[PDB]
Amino acid sequence: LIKKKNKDIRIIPLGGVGEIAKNMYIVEVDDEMFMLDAGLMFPEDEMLGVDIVIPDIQYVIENKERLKGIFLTHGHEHAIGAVSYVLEQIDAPVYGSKLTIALVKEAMKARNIKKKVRYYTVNHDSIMRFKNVNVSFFNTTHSIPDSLGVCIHTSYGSIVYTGEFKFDQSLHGHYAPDLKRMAEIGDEGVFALISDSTEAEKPGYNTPENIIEHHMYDAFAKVKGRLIVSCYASNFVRIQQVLNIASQLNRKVSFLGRSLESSFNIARKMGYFDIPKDLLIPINEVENYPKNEVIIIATGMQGEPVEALSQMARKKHKIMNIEEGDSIFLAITASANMEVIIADTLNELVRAGAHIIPNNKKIHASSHGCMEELKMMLNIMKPEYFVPVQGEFKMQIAHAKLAAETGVAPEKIFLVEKGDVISYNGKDMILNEKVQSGNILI
Ligand SMILES: [Mn+2]
Numbered sequence: 001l002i003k004k005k006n007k008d009i010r011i012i013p014l015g016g017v018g019e020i021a022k023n024m025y026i027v028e029v030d031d032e033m034f035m036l037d038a039g040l041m042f043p044e045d046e047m048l049g050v051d052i053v054i055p056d057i058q059y060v061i062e063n064k065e066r067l068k069g070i071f072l073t074h075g076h077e078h079a080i081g082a083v084s085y086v087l088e089q090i091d092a093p094v095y096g097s098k099l100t101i102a103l104v105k106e107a108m109k110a111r112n113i114k115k116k117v118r119y120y121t122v123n124h125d126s127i128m129r130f131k132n133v134n135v136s137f138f139n140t141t142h143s144i145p146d147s148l149g150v151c152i153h154t155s156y157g158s159i160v161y162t163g164e165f166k167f168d169q170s171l172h173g174h175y176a177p178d179l180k181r182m183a184e185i186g187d188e189g190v191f192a193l194i195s196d197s198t199e200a201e202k203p204g205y206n207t208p209e210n211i212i213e214h215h216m217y218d219a220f221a222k223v224k225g226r227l228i229v230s231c232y233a234s235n236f237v238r239i240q241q242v243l244n245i246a247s248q249l250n251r252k253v254s255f256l257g258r259s260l261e262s263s264f265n266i267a268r269k270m271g272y273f274d275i276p277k278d279l280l281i282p283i284n285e286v287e288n289y290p291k292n293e294v295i296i297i298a299t300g301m302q303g304e305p306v307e308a309l310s311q312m313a314r315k316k317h318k319i320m321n322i323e324e325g326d327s328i329f330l331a332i333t334a335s336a337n338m339e340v341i342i343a344d345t346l347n348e349l350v351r352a353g354a355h356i357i358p359n360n361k362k363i364h365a366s367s368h369g370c371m372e373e374l375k376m377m378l379n380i381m382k383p384e385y386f387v388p389v390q391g392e393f394k395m396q397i398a399h400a401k402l403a404a405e406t407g408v409a410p411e412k413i414f415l416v417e418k419g420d421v422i423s424y425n426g427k428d429m430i431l432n433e434k435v436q437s438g439n440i441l442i
Helices: 058-062 083-089 098-110 179-188 209-220 236-248 262-269 283-288 304-313 336-352 371-381 393-406
Strands: 009-015 024-029 032-036 053-055 067-071 094-096 119-121 127-129 134-140 147-154 157-161 190-196 227-232 252-255 294-300 327-331 383-389 420-424 429-434 439-441
Touching (some): 024 147, 024 157, 094 098, 098 119, 098 262, 134 179, 179 190, 179 371, 190 371, 209 236, 227 236, 227 304, 236 252, 236 262, 236 327, 294 304, 304 327, 304 336, 371 393, 383 393
Parallel strands (some): 067 094, 157 190, 227 294, 227 327, 252 294
Antiparallel strands (some): 024 032, 053 439, 127 134, 134 147
């Protein structure tokens, strides 16, 4: 519900536009400022070495007095990766789901930041109140559980930020969408919608996750020897899928040494995963079992999951190496930037004499909605104004075209770069100002 009659609305992207951010979107209602997400970016191609890129928050610092909070949609590193670095320079309350807050806390622990932080755990029923506006939330479907959309209630209508999202008819736990809550927000009136454009260029729909799990099952069932599956640590659904399959094929699961990935292990201890007892075994205990009774999972982030298999195929891995008659499956989705290292690794896999489980080319796997899924969000929301984010310029354009198709006025669709300022007086929406933005390498 709306608290007061508002005057000024400003929307500023400091990350996540013209790039696969590294998400950070600043929303201002009158004298109050809100930051939606704070992601990092891994440097793209170029030269391999440096670890991370974060947004320039100089505009936020100059107006730190007005920052009422930081709102985090999900626990991925493109959403919460730069939070610690923001919290060093500014002190603001952090809002997120139960899992997201846990993952942020771990990030602060890992950087040995002992500074006290005000954490507020939110859910789809939470309604956070401020001087000028009320903020509500709704569940979204993503590769990680407890992802939320943010709804800022103003007199002009709702400012909605989707975060990264999808629409899958097979995911229905803490991955479930809030169709009712979304529909309500739409009917009460959405002033401006800020949505994910990552897969805006791909027509149609994502392949439903259950179809993917089924095809993995049928493929894994044929494996007579050892099986090694490569995954992103970010993709909890794919991880949950192989755990299900291993249980059904009476195999047991082992992660690469020497311990477990932090995000996975936090979510596991909070009960987000469905894991039978003694399904997981330590990597040192793998030799005790016959080759056909183990599934080894290689997880990573930057693109190592592929690199790890290269190190295994080429007898150079510090923990475990590939032996002839081993089976390999890539449970990932390949960026054009990683087409080359997959091709090289596959070759080395074949030279080691490993069986390559082929990826179904009819399958399109993504954490982000395709054209029709994005139009789905647009049809439910029915925004007056649209601001496509989370994509390169070509991706943003594609998302804009989708919006126009759903009935959003072309005049009211805005394509922006980092530092651009979208302002609303009460009559006209204008892009007339530009603030400090950029990339900070770390
Ligand atoms: Mn994500």
